[PDB]
Amino acid sequence: PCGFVVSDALEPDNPIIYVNTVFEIVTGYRAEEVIGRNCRFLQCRHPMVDSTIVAKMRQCLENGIEFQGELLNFRKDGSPLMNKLRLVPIREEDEITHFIGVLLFTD
């Protein structure tokens, strides 16, 4: 079961706009708390989440390339999971206006 998320890359830090229903039920974070926030927070940082893999995203995010990787993220319950994120830059004219994260949670 994939959870989905979208970011407006035209704003600063790509704030979230959409949250899939399963994301709402497997992160405890209903849409209202996380919209306008970037998803920088799902790992919060916390020392044990791999520092490199997080930096590899932001580098990959600038040029606008697909990134597939796997971090451990935790609900605000503190209970941790890990997913393989797929971040998909979407563009048309062709400027990266939106981002789509397709993350598949696994505790």
Binding site: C2, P15, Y18, G36, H98, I100
Partner: protein, 529 residues
Amino acid sequence: RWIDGLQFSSLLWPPPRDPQQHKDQVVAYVEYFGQFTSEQFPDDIAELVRHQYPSTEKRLLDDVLAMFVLHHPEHGHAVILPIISCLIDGSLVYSKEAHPFASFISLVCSEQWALACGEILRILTHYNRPIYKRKPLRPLSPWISDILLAAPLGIRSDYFRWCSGVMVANGAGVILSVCDDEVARYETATLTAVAVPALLLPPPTTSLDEHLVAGLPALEPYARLFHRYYAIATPSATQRLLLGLLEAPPSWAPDALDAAVQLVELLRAAEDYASGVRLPRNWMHLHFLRAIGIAMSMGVAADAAAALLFRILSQPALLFEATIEATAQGIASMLCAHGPEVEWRICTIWEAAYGLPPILSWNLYIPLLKVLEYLPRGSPSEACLMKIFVATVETILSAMSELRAMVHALFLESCAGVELASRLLFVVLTVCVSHGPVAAFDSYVLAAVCALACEVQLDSAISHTRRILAILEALFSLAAAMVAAHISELFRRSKALTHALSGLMRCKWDKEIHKRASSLYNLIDVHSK
């Protein structure tokens, strides 16, 4: 010396059954007792009571003790207090038929009688502070109750006026503890029924001097009392109660409105912890909103209830599952029933309430949606909530980007109403173009549509697509032809939306999603150009 004398009298043996000898004999001892009244008298009776009590037989000593207090209230202190101390000790258990108390309950059931009665209650109040010697309790709370119970309504009302300080133990403490003992041991609540009018409403005018100089007490401690009274009070009684407080003179209340609102705070607060009595599910509407409107419907009394709604709607915590529906449903109903004239006022009070004051936020409007669902079609009330809507949207436009989440909510949260949300989002978009913000609305649609379109193709997820198609399908239908031009221009200048619609068209996994997706598309085509 003299205690030792009456030690073998008929004072300690059961009262003669003859009424005439009962009366003649008691008349004789009350004069023997009262002959002394020396410095020693309190010390004298104190030895007499602890030594001679408690016994289980009915004795003539009870009646001499009880009467001497009546004929000499000046010395009620020296008589009751030895008993008070043993009640504190545990020497005496208090039974309403325990025999020192059997008669003091009986003398109370005539101005001489009233004063003696009064002082008995005035004494027992001061010693009634809580002790622990199994919760800690107030030792003399129940005795006050049975005396107050077996008593005319005139003195109960004056006991609570005196006790709460309308004109040593906490005044608020005893009233709560004697009102509970009645509820606790008896199965009714008549003392709390006289106490709540006693605190909120002024003395009766016929009692002039008292009436002129009296003040509303501090209502903070009697927050349970009001809950318990309002939990049981027939709805007609509370509207009698509220109006009386509303149209009281200003010497009574600094601001009666502040106190009427304060009362509401306390029943709401006591609702979370009160046990045994639960307020009705429409308690905010039933005991208040029903009444507050009618005042407007029926001289200057109507004028003061109008100040309450401005007060009620300038502090929007009334809206703060089923209580919200009923609270919201109630607001809708008081609007409809009262008449066109009052609705125009209610609505203009509402506008003056919301800064047209509190700030305006989308979170403020989530409750009014549940009110608006119940409103009828085309009424000025609907217009008023939609007018406050535009006010909210105007204000948010003026960092955290509440707007981005708002549109998500109308589009998909089901907060609810596809009928409303189509109408609501139409307003939302129209405000953004006036002022960028229009990109936000432009941007979210693609994100939601395409993310949900991808999820379906790859139970709740399919349900939301249907809703978004219908909201957009209806945005075409309902500057109604003008927004339609914008959506069609939005869809076919972005290749992502273009693809997502097409796959939805051909989806048979869900019957209604592709009937719907087809229609939206054809609507895009015609309004595209």
